Amino acid sequence: VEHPEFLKAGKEPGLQIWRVEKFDLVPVPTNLYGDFFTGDAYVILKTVQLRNGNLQYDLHYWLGNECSQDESGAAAIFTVQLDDYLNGRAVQHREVQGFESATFLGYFKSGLKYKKGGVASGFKH
Amino acid sequence: DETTALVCDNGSGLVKAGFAGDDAPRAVFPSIVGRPRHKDSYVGDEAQSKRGILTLKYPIEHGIITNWDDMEKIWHHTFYNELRVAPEEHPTLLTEAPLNPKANREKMTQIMFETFNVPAMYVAIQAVLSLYASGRTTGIVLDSGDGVTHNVPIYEGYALPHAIMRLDLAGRDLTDYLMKILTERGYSFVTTAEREIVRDIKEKLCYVALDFENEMATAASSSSLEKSYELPDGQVITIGNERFRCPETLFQPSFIGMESAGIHETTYNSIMKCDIDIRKDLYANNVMSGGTTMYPGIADRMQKEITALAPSTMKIKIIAPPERKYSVWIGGSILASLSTFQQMWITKQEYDEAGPSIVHRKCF
Ligand SMILES: Nc1ncnc2c1ncn2[C@@H]1O[C@H](COP(=O)(O)OP(=O)(O)OP(=O)(O)O)[C@@H](O)[C@H]1O
Ligand SMILES: [Ca+2]
Ligand SMILES: [Ca+2]
Ligand SMILES: [Ca+2]
């Protein structure tokens, strides 16, 4: 993969959030982190600094209650692809709205928030 | 639909074909090739209609391509007759059975590039695409179609070949069985035209019982399980304990004289062949895929059947999406549509340079 977002992923400690937008991985404005559209799917990468100098990786794909099948399917594939690109070093986690893990919920210091709506599906019906 | 990726899901009984980005296959037809008994051939519905003057052949047996000459006809018909595309204009994604032999994957790559001249192609495992379509990267897929049933456990996007289970009992075998028991009840279903009627009855009235024994007894009491079915000729028949006896075969293959374990056992068994540390994830992500998983009640019986087999503290979940007859195709349509998938394709350039062996390094 030569996708520009792939080139930016896991380069340094922190939190990176992308939203699935019509079959593409689109970065979320850092000011909007924690505000999740329940009609959309997202890919979150958490990069932690290890004392061995190396970087630890946790990939979470978050699925809103109303997200379309192409968005949930793409978030899952993008996750696999981001993991492989990171030499399989990432641990993958499926996050469903209302059933998020304590770890993922912990990434958001002012608490994660749900908001109705989202970007339209990428499918042709 | 101009310079758009195509997705072709080739099954033992049906070919599912269309365009990447569509939410469903544009063409669904029988994977059959008809030749004059004694154009030079027909494919699909055309072949079935003229069945009376043709010799019918199925190029895919138990999910595996077995007749290369007949498969090229299928693909030609798919491109030209059903999709109405110039193959040389569209990157093409094909699907394959888990444990698909090395030489078969090469053959498929060669024919696409050498006979059809595609600008690019890719082969993906059917069960993995179903998992992707359900929005998961980890889970165990139960894929059951017309010719084969498999249990495919997948972790973080990749099948675990060592733990896959294959069972040569599926849709066609169920159709044949319902035929036998239905004539046993007093009716008469022997003819190919009649096999077709039975298949429709199999798909419309059959279901899986939550408790097979109680079901049998409840069918011997009142007639609350009985259902009516209108024949093409207008005659009405009454179907009884066969509604649930036919798919029972999936759980008790002994019914058809098969020695194998049922699909609940092969599921439990595949899971137990996996690393202990992932079993919980498998158990909580049981995805049903394919036509033979469409019986009403199938998800509840499996839910019941596997909680009985697994440790009492295992969170168990069966996922049986309404569109699961097309899950594989849909998974392909999403995969081939992704912005990040464009460098994944095998190019004609790469094929000319490396040959058919390229498939083993590009698709895994
Ligand atoms: N509603 C239904 N109930 C039961 N069986 C069904 C239903 N709909 C379709 N089927 C059966 O599913 C089969 C076709 O399913 P599918 O397209 O998944 O198989 P395939 O890809 O051709 O085969 P395979 O995976 O074995 O190679 C046929 O046996 C058909 O009768
Ligand atoms: Ca959306
Ligand atoms: Ca990994
Ligand atoms: Ca199939």
Numbering used by the authors:
A (entry chain S): 3 to 127
B (entry chain A): 3 to 40, 50 to 375
From the manuscript:
However, the molecular basis of such dynamic behavior of Mical-oxidized (Mox) actin and the mechanisms underlying its disassembly are hitherto unknown. Thus, Mical-induced oxidation of actin—including augmentation of cofilin severing—provides a robust mechanism to disassemble different actin forms (ATP/ADP-Pi- and ADP-bound) in response to cellular signaling.
To this end, we obtained a 2.7 Å resolution crystal structure of Mical-oxidized actin complexed with gelsolin segment-1 (GS1)18. The electron density of the DNAse I binding loop (D-loop)—where Mical’s target M44 and M47 residues reside—is weak, which is indicative of multiple conformations of this loop. In Mox-G-actin structure we observed a slight (~ 1 Å) narrowing of the nucleotide binding cleft (between subdomains 2 and 4) compared to that in the crystal structure of unmodified G-actin-GS1. Narrowing of nucleotide binding cleft could potentially affect nucleotide exchange rate in Mox-actin and affect its recycling in vivo. To test this directly we measured the rates of ɛ-ATP exchange in Mical-oxidized and unmodified G-actin. We found no statistically significant differences in the nucleotide exchange rates between Mical-oxidized and unoxidized actin in the absence and in the presence of profilin.
